[PDB]
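User: As part of a screening pipeline, I want to sanity-check one entry by hand. Below is the sequence and the SMILES for calcium ion. Please return the complex as structure tokens so I can compare it with the automated output.
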Amino acid sequence: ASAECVSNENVEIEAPKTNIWTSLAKEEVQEVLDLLHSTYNITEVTKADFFSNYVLWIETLKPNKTEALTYLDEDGDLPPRNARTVVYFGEGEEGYFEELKVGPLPVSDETTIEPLSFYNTNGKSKLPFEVGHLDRIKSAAKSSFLNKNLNTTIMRDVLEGLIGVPYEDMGCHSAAPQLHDPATGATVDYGTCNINTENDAENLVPTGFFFKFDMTGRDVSQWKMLEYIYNNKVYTSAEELYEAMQKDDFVTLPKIDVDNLDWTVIQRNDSAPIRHLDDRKSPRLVEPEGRRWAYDGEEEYFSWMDWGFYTSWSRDTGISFYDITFKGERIVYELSLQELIAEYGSDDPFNQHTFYSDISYGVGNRFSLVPGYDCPATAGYFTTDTFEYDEFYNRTLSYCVFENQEDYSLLRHTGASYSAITQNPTLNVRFISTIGNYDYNFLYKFFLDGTLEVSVRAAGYIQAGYWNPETSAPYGLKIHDVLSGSFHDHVLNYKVDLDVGGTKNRASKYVMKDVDVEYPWAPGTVYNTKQIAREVLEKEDFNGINWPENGQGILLIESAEETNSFGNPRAYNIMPGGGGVHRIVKNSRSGPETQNWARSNLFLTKHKDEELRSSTALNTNALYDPPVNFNAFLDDESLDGEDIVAWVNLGLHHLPNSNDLPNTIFSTAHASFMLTPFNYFDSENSRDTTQQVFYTYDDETEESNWEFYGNDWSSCGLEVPEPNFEDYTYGRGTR
Amino acid sequence: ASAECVSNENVEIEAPKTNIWTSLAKEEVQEVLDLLHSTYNITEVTKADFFSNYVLWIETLKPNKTEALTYLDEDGDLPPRNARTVVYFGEGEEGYFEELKVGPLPVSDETTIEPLSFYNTNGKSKLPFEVGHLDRIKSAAKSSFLNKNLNTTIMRDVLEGLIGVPYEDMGCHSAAPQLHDPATGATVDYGTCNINTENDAENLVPTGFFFKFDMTGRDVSQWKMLEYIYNNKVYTSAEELYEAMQKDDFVTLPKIDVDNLDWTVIQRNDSAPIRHLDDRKSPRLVEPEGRRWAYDGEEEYFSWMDWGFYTSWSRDTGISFYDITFKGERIVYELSLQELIAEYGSDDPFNQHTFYSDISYGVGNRFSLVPGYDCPATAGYFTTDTFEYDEFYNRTLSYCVFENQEDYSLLRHTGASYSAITQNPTLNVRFISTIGNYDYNFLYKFFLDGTLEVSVRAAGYIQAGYWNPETSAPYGLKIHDVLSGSFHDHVLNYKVDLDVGGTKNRASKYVMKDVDVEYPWAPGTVYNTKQIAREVLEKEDFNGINWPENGQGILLIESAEETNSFGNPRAYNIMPGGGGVHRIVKNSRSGPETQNWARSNLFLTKHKDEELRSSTALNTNALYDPPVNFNAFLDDESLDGEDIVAWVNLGLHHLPNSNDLPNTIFSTAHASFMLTPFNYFDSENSRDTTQQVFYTYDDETEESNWEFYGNDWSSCGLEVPEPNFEDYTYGRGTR
Ligand SMILES: *[C@@H]1O[C@H](CO)[C@@H](O[C@@H]2O[C@H](CO)[C@@H](O)[C@H](O)[C@H]2NC(C)=O)[C@H](O)[C@H]1NC(C)=O
Ligand SMILES: *[C@@H]1O[C@H](CO)[C@@H](O[C@@H]2O[C@H](CO)[C@@H](O)[C@H](O)[C@H]2NC(C)=O)[C@H](O)[C@H]1NC(C)=O
Ligand SMILES: *[C@@H]1O[C@H](CO)[C@@H](O)[C@H](O)[C@H]1NC(C)=O
Ligand SMILES: *[C@@H]1O[C@H](CO)[C@@H](O)[C@H](O)[C@H]1NC(C)=O
Ligand SMILES: *[C@@H]1O[C@H](CO)[C@@H](O)[C@H](O)[C@H]1NC(C)=O
Ligand SMILES: *[C@@H]1O[C@H](CO)[C@@H](O)[C@H](O)[C@H]1NC(C)=O
Ligand SMILES: *[C@@H]1O[C@H](CO)[C@@H](O)[C@H](O)[C@H]1NC(C)=O
Ligand SMILES: *[C@@H]1O[C@H](CO)[C@@H](O)[C@H](O)[C@H]1NC(C)=O
Ligand SMILES: *[C@@H]1O[C@H](CO)[C@@H](O)[C@H](O)[C@H]1NC(C)=O
Ligand SMILES: *[C@@H]1O[C@H](CO)[C@@H](O)[C@H](O)[C@H]1NC(C)=O
Ligand SMILES: [Ca+2]
Ligand SMILES: [Ca+2]
Ligand SMILES: [Ca+2]
Ligand SMILES: [Ca+2]
Ligand SMILES: [Cu+2]
Ligand SMILES: [Cu+2]
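Assistant: Here is the complex for your manual check:
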């Protein structure tokens, strides 16, 4: 019956400047790859080995900050357009990966190729083979080596006898990182076997069969199996284990029931009854009058309710944000996820040697978002791209942008014959990175007042461990017949380059404490009360900062000189949400210097172009001398009136239980922090939105009045649209 | 063009049992009131004074637990229907309020009236006048007394001279609680004046003029002003202050600019430009196939996706939940907010003496919800009632129930040529209590797997303080010309009577720690790793529990006897969210024994019917001997295999800044906790929902398949309905 709601089309805009942080165009990558091929003897990755040279990566080397700001704020020149490339060189006496700068682009006679190392605290462009990237070539070699050893007549018999299925029915693989010893030069690695499945559930059927091997050097004929480990006993050869197994006293631990694996299946059971009313569609968010954010498609610049920002995408980390402005002023120069680790504790030599660096695998080289489900149907989707091993990957549905209506209002008050309520619509930018078993859901949520919330939720299949009743209990709960929910930490680092009221800032904390005082108006009477005291964080602190006990503090990044009208420094408060935790372990043999940012909740440093990133894709196996040692940034420099960067961590101490099988859920695996204005303005700045109501009641007449500021709530008809399911296809990008 | 979405009607059901916790029917109240009138000499409140007898309150006295459970679970008899009443008796030599039980009901010859005290730990049914409730009669007496003193010729002159406006233009009022001294019997109180406004913004214009009076006893002619306090100086009489003001050296502090108060106005400034695209309506939640939760209107019993529960309403606290079940098993007998405090720290004698008990004022006797804004347009609304001072109040739109679509999925995984994603619809029960200046938004959010989240958000006008540059800085920021953002704690207590796998439970924690160990598979090699250790909380601990540093623990309520299939006790995890904070102050002269639950994050006690509630509406002024001293519950009783209650706190340390003017916002003033299954089942239990997708792709054919389990996402038309605005009228209930 009702008239149709008033439709409006999506709005596109022109960015104020070009996106100087954007990924390389296909043509730029091609020119660089061509130049690499004409400069060096380059072999195609599919034909390469440890003695070839081949190209791994080619991506944008982002501009330095000062040149970026000059361009953005002072009509300066476009910064130089350069590529970072990573090439493996095996032609020489020793193999190594080298980072090289190729630029400027487009390729011309001005273009040079030079060693690139300025952002590496270790000062090196070359990463030695022994601590090299676990790339396609090294992975294939390790796989071939494991097969060579595990598929002999003897080992086939040992594996089947212990595990209960033949070798064809399991998959053997290695722990990460590898373990290189700089003192002796040896490189060893542990591994395990899991039952093969058709539903990606291998991590739920680990067999408890382990091994250790020596993979030192580029000649694989010299690699050797060192140990087989089973039921906490060590065997130095296949033969020794085989013989042990023939003895009457040999103990074989309970085997996995591979005929009953329904408990690992995620999707719906066709025999399961529907809950009452679940035969009705769940609620849907709709936009009655169309989309309320705008964008420039060519420059990936976004605008929504006085916020602006550009996005950028990398293979290592996924999305990044640059030049985030609110009401025309920059609040954050760069906001960028840097690293995510997963560090296991266990009784067994596979999980106890697991300390993943997810950027080493790649966070930005995964799968598309599923419309309607991973993001609401009203989302818009964006394509990004990467380059790896000879192929340029186009990734559609890479990230999404949507306006939510939060289910609580932004503010309200009822009094004095009126009610004033302001709605809480938010802009949301999401991407989801499924890295093997885990699914990481990243969200950036912007609010009308100038507040931004950064969050992550995790789900997917856990990396469980075999349950041995004699030894597994201190490290996990028994969650299935022979399965432990191995204990681990997830920790993520974010580079938060706040520039509050300019680049020159101070960091301070309001410390809250109870104190005994006497007041002039009650002489002699002691009162126990509470006070605040502002403390300036004067210099970089090696210990970092941990959130105060009982929440007794507020952490601010202040403008050094700008104040509001009441004399307060303009500031933003870094407010922790859930997941304000850091690593429990302090001294890991699997990460001695490779992830040193993960030991406190947050760190504050002086901004430097050479301190670009807190980890690298090349860090994980370089245990003692990684390209970036985060601790090198902490060298007691003044932060008092300086360009400051906050490196903020979110984390989870995950101890999986029944509520993680078959999968972990996103609702209770959540971490977040907010950046909220604190004396940044003279008042709270959502007041100008039209998405609010002002209700008044007239005491004489007994007449109500409703002011909706141009929003007509009358019933109207709308089409609830089918999501773009057709745009989703399985896979990690189009090559 | 698209066909219309398939509509369905709201579903109503019959509760399995009657709501034995429900508020008294009007007829029940009438019968009790009539019986009180025939038993005692009762005066009508509008004609009463300190020497009259009059009725304050009449409400349901809820059943004891064992009798309730016999009725619910074993087809036992309905528990006795009883009223708790509170009557002021002034006819004697000393005045007191007395609690009286009237029952059973309906009124018959079986009905008696008896002193009621079993839930008061002090063992008394009588509250002495000096520590009495701040009721209509006492408020009136205090108001008259203040006018009699502040409106003399001399004080009119003093007030106008110091404040800059005449007496008619300000309002003077008293700090809460009052200050009764048991040793001498004296009762005193502080107070201040605020500028009158037309928009209920008095709290933003405190004058810095203070006073102190003695209000001991029932003869107001003996009450007397003790002090006037201004600029931190004390005057013992109006004359003394008047004389000082005439001297040349008298310092008058800066006055409020009463002609420029636009900064206190909440609603939109009509001259503000609209932000880009804010002339489009913000997004709306819609239900394409109708509502998916059901209820019994007569019994206030609710059903959604295998959850069931009953609600109850009280003047003191608002909503409570009883008999919360999931998949046919009770997990929580009673979930009830118990108290909310707001405790201020200040340099001044008004704010420093402010320690509000919100249940003393009433959390459940406030205003209706505003449709569409306070709750989404798809919400259903419920009417509740209370009785106070001769009047039965019917409160429509008292609470709302709605299904949200959260903007992130419940779980997902992509791998092995499939993607499986489960949506996250939640049931939400909300009420909002606006108590003078503050607006408290309470939300109860139920998830598909059996998790429940309890949260609060706060907004409204802060109780600010006059800014004296000489003394105010340790207690607040200067947020307007003569205004301080007075530091305060908000703390809320919730009674969480979990009964996990029966009433007989244990409480435990998994403690997480780093440890150095050696493993059998690598003799002599030390590893720094991490472990969990389960510790049973054997006995009640006076210190309560504070959440562990760096989050290194999981707190569980376990069934004492029931386990899942893998030997683990069935449990629920009490998971803190934001706002896991308790009072900073330890020893307040304004709450010595009245709020003893607020000093730690959580307490575990043995369930007792006599330990019904952790505070009472009668606690606030009874500083040393309140009806309930929570510490009485903590007497070292075993909890090892007992009915346990968790008293869980949520809080905020609020240091208002610019982002709180003109009002605090709900987005960043948030606290929550969750109750989540932990080995409660053998697996995660959302898997039977139909609100999920299973996408598969075949690598041979390149064909995709989408399984939506009966949910048709094809575009369809619906009407976006106008909220029931017509049901909203201003006011605190219909009398
Ligand atoms: C961005 O800044 C970095 C750090 O200042 C520059 O790094 C220098 O690079 C040159 C050659 O490229 C080296 O000789 C210097 O030793 C580097 N300095 C440091 C501190 O390591 C880098 O060149 C800058 N990038 C651009 C595009 O100008
Ligand atoms: C609910 O249980 C309480 C606690 O057992 C009962 O309180 C007893 O009440 C009687 C008289 O009412 C007193 O003699 C006892 O001393 C009380 N016991 C305690 C421990 O205080 C209360 O009566 C019960 N309520 C109902 C409706 O039966
Ligand atoms: C280029 O490298 C390949 C791979 O090792 C090698 O076979 C070949 O000898 C090299 N060719 C030249 C020009 O040296
Ligand atoms: C393993 O050995 C078996 C039997 O000897 C053989 O059939 C199979 O091809 C081998 N597998 C691999 C991957 O080499
Ligand atoms: C479906 O449910 C039935 C009944 O419990 C069970 O036997 C079977 O294992 C389930 N199948 C799957 C794939 O979960
Ligand atoms: C990548 O996808 C985008 C948008 O889906 C498209 O416009 C662009 O042409 C694609 N690039 C290539 C090289 O196919
Ligand atoms: C009834 O109470 C009123 C008010 O206190 C009082 O005036 C009157 O004396 C009372 N009647 C009796 C019999 O005490
Ligand atoms: C205060 O006194 C003034 C003048 O003496 C009078 O006009 C006014 O009504 C009084 N206010 C009250 C509340 O009695
Ligand atoms: C409305 O905006 C104008 C222009 O900035 C300002 O002068 C005035 O104070 C505002 N009024 C209110 C009620 O906020
Ligand atoms: C209270 O309000 C409800 C719903 O509006 C109504 O059904 C009921 O009759 C009212 N009760 C009284 C006593 O008016
Ligand atoms: Ca900065
Ligand atoms: Ca430094
Ligand atoms: Ca219990
Ligand atoms: Ca006890
Ligand atoms: Cu995990
Ligand atoms: Cu507050």
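Points to compare against the pipeline: The pocket of ligand 1 is lined by residues A 64, 80, 118, 609-610 (CB under 6 Å). The radius of gyration of chain B is 29 Å.
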